[PDB]
Amino acid sequence: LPTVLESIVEGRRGHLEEIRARIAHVDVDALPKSTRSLFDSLNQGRGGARFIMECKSASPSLGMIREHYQPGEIARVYSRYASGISVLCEPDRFGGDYDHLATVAATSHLPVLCKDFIIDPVQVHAARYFGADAILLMLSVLDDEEYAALAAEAARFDLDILTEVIDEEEVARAIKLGAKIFGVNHRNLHDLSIDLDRSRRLSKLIPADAVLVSESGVRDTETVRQLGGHSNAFLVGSQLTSQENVDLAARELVYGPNKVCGLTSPSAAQTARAAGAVYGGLIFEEASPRNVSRETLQKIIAAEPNLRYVAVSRRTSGYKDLLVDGIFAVQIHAPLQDSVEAEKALIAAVREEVGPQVQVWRAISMSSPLGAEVAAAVEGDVDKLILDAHEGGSGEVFDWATVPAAVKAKSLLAGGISPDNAAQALAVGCAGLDINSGVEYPAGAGTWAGAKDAGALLKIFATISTFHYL
Amino acid sequence: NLPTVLESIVEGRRGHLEEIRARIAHVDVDALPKSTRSLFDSLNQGRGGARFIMECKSASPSLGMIREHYQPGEIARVYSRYASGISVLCEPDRFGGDYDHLATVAATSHLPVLCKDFIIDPVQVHAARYFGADAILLMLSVLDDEEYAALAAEAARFDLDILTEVIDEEEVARAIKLGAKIFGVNHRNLHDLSIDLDRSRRLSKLIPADAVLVSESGVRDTETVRQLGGHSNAFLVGSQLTSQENVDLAARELVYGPNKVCGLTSPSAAQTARAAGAVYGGLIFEEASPRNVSRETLQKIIAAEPNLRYVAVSRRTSGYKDLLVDGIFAVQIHAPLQDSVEAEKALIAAVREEVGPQVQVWRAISMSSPLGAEVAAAVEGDVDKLILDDWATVPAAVKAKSLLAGGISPDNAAQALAVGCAGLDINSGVEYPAGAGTWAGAKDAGALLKIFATISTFHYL
Numbered sequence A: 001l002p003t004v005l006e007s008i009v010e011g012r013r014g015h016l017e018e019i020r021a022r023i024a025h026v027d028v029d030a031l032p033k034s035t036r037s038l039f040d041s042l043n044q045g046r047g048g049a050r051f052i053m054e055c056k057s058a059s060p061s062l063g064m065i066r067e068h069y070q071p072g073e074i075a076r077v078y079s080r081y082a083s084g085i086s087v088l089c090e091p092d093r094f095g096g097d098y099d100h101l102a103t104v105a106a107t108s109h110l111p112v113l114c115k116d117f118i119i120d121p122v123q124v125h126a127a128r129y130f131g132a133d134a135i136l137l138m139l140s141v142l143d144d145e146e147y148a149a150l151a152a153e154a155a156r157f158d159l160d161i162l163t164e165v166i167d168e169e170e171v172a173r174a175i176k177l178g179a180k181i182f183g184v185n186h187r188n189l190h191d192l193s194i195d196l197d198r199s200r201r202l203s204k205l206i207p208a209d210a211v212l213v214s215e216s217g218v219r220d221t222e223t224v225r226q227l228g229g230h231s232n233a234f235l236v237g238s239q240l241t242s243q244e245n246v247d248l249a250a251r252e253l254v255y256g257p258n259k260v261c262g263l264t265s266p267s268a269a270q271t272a273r274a275a276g277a278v279y280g281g282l283i284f285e286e287a288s289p290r291n292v293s294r295e296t297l298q299k300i301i302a303a304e305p306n307l308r309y310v311a312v313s314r315r316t317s318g319y320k321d322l323l324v325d326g327i328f329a330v331q332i333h334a335p336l337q338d339s340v341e342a343e344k345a346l347i348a349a350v351r352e353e354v355g356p357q358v359q360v361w362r363a364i365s366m367s368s369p370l371g372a373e374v375a376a377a378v379e380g381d382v383d384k385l386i387l388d389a390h391e392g393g394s395g396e397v398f399d400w401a402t403v404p405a406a407v408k409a410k411s412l413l414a415g416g417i418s419p420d421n422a423a424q425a426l427a428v429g430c431a432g433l434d435i436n437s438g439v440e441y442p443a444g445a446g447t448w449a450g451a452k453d454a455g456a457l458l459k460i461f462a463t464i465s466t467f468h469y470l
Numbered sequence B: 001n002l003p004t005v006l007e008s009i010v011e012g013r014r015g016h017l018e019e020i021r022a023r024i025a026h027v028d029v030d031a032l033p034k035s036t037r038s039l040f041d042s043l044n045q046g047r048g049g050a051r052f053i054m055e056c057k058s059a060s061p062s063l064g065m066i067r068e069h070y071q072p073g074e075i076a077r078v079y080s081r082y083a084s085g086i087s088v089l090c091e092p093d094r095f096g097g098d099y100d101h102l103a104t105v106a107a108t109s110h111l112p113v114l115c116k117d118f119i120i121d122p123v124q125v126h127a128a129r130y131f132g133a134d135a136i137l138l139m140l141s142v143l144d145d146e147e148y149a150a151l152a153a154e155a156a157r158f159d160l161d162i163l164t165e166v167i168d169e170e171e172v173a174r175a176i177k178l179g180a181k182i183f184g185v186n187h188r189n190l191h192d193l194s195i196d197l198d199r200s201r202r203l204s205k206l207i208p209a210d211a212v213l214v215s216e217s218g219v220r221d222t223e224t225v226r227q228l229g230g231h232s233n234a235f236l237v238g239s240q241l242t243s244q245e246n247v248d249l250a251a252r253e254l255v256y257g258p259n260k261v262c263g264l265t266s267p268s269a270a271q272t273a274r275a276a277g278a279v280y281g282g283l284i285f286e287e288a289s290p291r292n293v294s295r296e297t298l299q300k301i302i303a304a305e306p307n308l309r310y311v312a313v314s315r316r317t318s319g320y321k322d323l324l325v326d327g328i329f330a331v332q333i334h335a336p337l338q339d340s341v342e343a344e345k346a347l348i349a350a351v352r353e354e355v356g357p358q359v360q361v362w363r364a365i366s367m368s369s370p371l372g373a374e375v376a377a378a379v380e381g382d383v384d385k386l387i388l389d390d391w392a393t394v395p396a397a398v399k400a401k402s403l404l405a406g407g408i409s410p411d412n413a414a415q416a417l418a419v420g421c422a423g424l425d426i427n428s429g430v431e432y433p434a435g436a437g438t439w440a441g442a443k444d445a446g447a448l449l450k451i452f453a454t455i456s457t458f459h460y461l
């Protein structure tokens, strides 16, 4: 008969005596106040795309997420991308403890949120003693009087409150109680169903001036970009802590699966990764001004091993020879073949060569009117499509209305993408951008002409970081 | 005849100006965004505030190549835990720097970023802002009052803070008249490359009391920080950090000192100790101890937090070889004191031979047992560290090599630090007391935050 939330809360009630004993030696009235404002960190406008990233090793819906749990290493990664860090403090269902909260508080500069099922002042005291700047209070668990009493306890220590609402009645209660941060949970915490539409619905009732946090179930940038317009912030956990490389997962979520292609130096790769790129492209084609030797290629990979490197070529065979330690994919940039059946054989030959640990991408010239047709036909035979102008490195666009809706979730958009047209490129709705000459130094830059322009990399990724559909 | 090192650097940089002008010729300078991070506000936390500007520097005139495998993004991630600012060398010919390094750091870190360049032309100020700087260095050793004011006015167009570098009384007077808000006292003479660590104390008598004073260069250890801290808002530290393989461990060692959290019995305690600032973690191998750790628990703690140097602690006089697993940095001989000095030296020699030359050897001495003090001085040269359980005429030799132990707690930490040992050995004073139920004797994460906050800004008076 008990729901998941009722089980969790009754479990937490049974922890209160242990928590009281754990901090019985602490002088609660002398506790230092929090000096980090989660409100001011999240209060950057609807569309501001602030992330609260969550340290979570396990959950009722997923089970064990991250067995080898280093909250301090996760917090260091989160300190690059996030505007707040959420730490599960609940032990029986989430693998959490107050030691995780303290580890995160000492590791990060960000405001730290104790994510707990709070029903008693002792949990507020514990939160502050172990380093929290904010607590979660849930209107699904607390009546108005219990909420005010715990909110007043939080106010004693300058703890911000994330006020969790799941419906129209909780929104009206939160307004009456003077909530400043509304947390809309997409997850129904009784039956664990997800409704991503819940934040759009409740944003109609939540005050225009209030901070709105969209929590739970956000797995990809397309969701971020759909929800961005009515959200100050996202709370995101398992999409990050389920991946071996948390820093790559954060970039893939916040920015998307974007490639900075034509890398020819170690420092360009480090700049691309710092800025937020997931993929680095290395060109293996004699005719290209961006061509790299085996020597450069290994120097770039060693200097910045946190990109996924794509070996790009126009060849139709010999992809085997482009492979080294760190190559995540090959991008077949050959001209369009005679038939769909020859594209499918070209792809299966390369997949044979590179083996099953190495992805196979296909560039399609959409400058051709046959491009759209090959794209839909080969979509299921490749890991990614590049939808490109001419035959690569042109720095020119094609008609972006030419991209079929079918393939977008598998596609990087390519061809003259620059800081000036980035917003318009993101609006096409492909999973990612392929970025090359549009962030290069132009022809008048002297010996720097054609090298990656670190200032152009800062601008385009800042544009990407807050893009949402209008 | 031969130009000084500073003269060669400045003239080399004059020869790069054509390359820089072309590199940013496509940039609309008038429309550059302003910096929104204040180095001034970050550093303006009082004399003794111990704010660090940590420097990304891969090479110097004085040291040659410091860090060949250079990842400014990974170093900035480490620095973002400890620092109140990040300095990035942009000078390419002697310091291995580039504006890409500046941009990588600006994109990686939340902190105000300082372009560390020899600035002589407005193009360098424009480039600094475009590649993400929040602050620039202007050197009164390089610029006359007119050159400085033209460059400081360019800087003010973009909300760039200025680190005004001064080396003598003449330069501080000029800096006051020019309206400088941040005084960078270089301990290093850039003509003869000599270091005078006493120069920040001397120029602090002439620098306005309400002004930010940054003590730059030559700071290698926490004893120097604690000595200079009283007259400093901040320290700028580079090669002590970038010359070490593990920059996070070197940052902790410099900011907090070589402190140990002993008697670790859980993975979360070790993670908390490392996050708080600890360099060493102690693991006890004694069946008598409530802090005794199994083989299995030992390997869980090390794997959960591999960024502490682990110290195997035992009362045994032999059998130190079968305490060694991967991650064991040191052994701590916690045997009851032997009959004489010679039996102590011989106990230590025998432990050296068991663990071999890759494993440090530490000796715990009880300072009550009055032969204790004599043994300490006798064996100091034969151990890598002492653990000392007077303090008026305990030699400076013994102090520099010692962790002070004896119920160190959040309440007495400042008094312990005033003794002047290199480090603190912290155990029961950060444990939950007997009334904590199942938590009795585990490490109190809240006590670790408090004691390390006190260490972080301790200076001598």
Ligand SMILES: O=C(O)c1ccccc1NC[C@@H](O)[C@H](O)[C@H](O)COP(=O)(O)O
Pocket (backbone or CB within 6 Å): A004, A005, A008, A054, A056, A059, A060, A061, A062, A115, A187, A189, A192, A215, A216, A217, A218, A235, A236, A237, A238, A239
């Ligand atoms: O996540 C669950 O399975 C669950 C179950 C019952 C009660 C609460 C739950 N979630 C806790 C909540 O803090 C979520 O972890 C965050 O909102 C992050 O959601 P995520 O991005 O991992 O889907």
Ligand SMILES: O=C(O)c1ccccc1NC[C@@H](O)[C@H](O)[C@H](O)COP(=O)(O)O
Pocket (backbone or CB within 6 Å): A261, A262, A281, A283, A285, A288, A289, A290, A312, A313, A314, A333, A386, A388, A389, A391, A392, A393, A394, A395, A396, A414, A415, A416, A417, A434, A435, A436, A437, A438
């Ligand atoms: O860029 C090159 O020189 C080159 C040469 C041969 C094959 C592919 C090449 N380009 C890699 C390709 O993914 C490019 O990143 C895209 O075509 C976008 O280039 P852009 O038009 O932005 O300069």
Ligand SMILES: O=C(O)c1ccccc1NC[C@@H](O)[C@H](O)[C@H](O)COP(=O)(O)O
Pocket (backbone or CB within 6 Å): B005, B006, B009, B055, B057, B060, B061, B062, B063, B116, B188, B190, B216, B217, B218, B219, B236, B237, B238, B239, B240
């Ligand atoms: O450090 C040098 O060798 C040198 C030589 C000539 C001119 C300037 C120099 N130093 C640049 C200066 O920014 C220093 O790197 C910082 O003050 C950090 O000093 P450190 O802590 O590395 O001794």
Ligand SMILES: O=C(O)c1ccccc1NC[C@@H](O)[C@H](O)[C@H](O)COP(=O)(O)O
Pocket (backbone or CB within 6 Å): B262, B263, B282, B284, B286, B289, B290, B291, B313, B314, B315, B334, B387, B389, B405, B406, B407, B408, B425, B426, B427, B428, B429
């Ligand atoms: O702590 C123990 O139980 C133990 C047991 C056997 C041998 C040595 C032990 N202690 C480790 C030692 O490094 C201690 O940190 C110091 O002696 C200081 O202990 P304190 O008095 O601060 O608890």
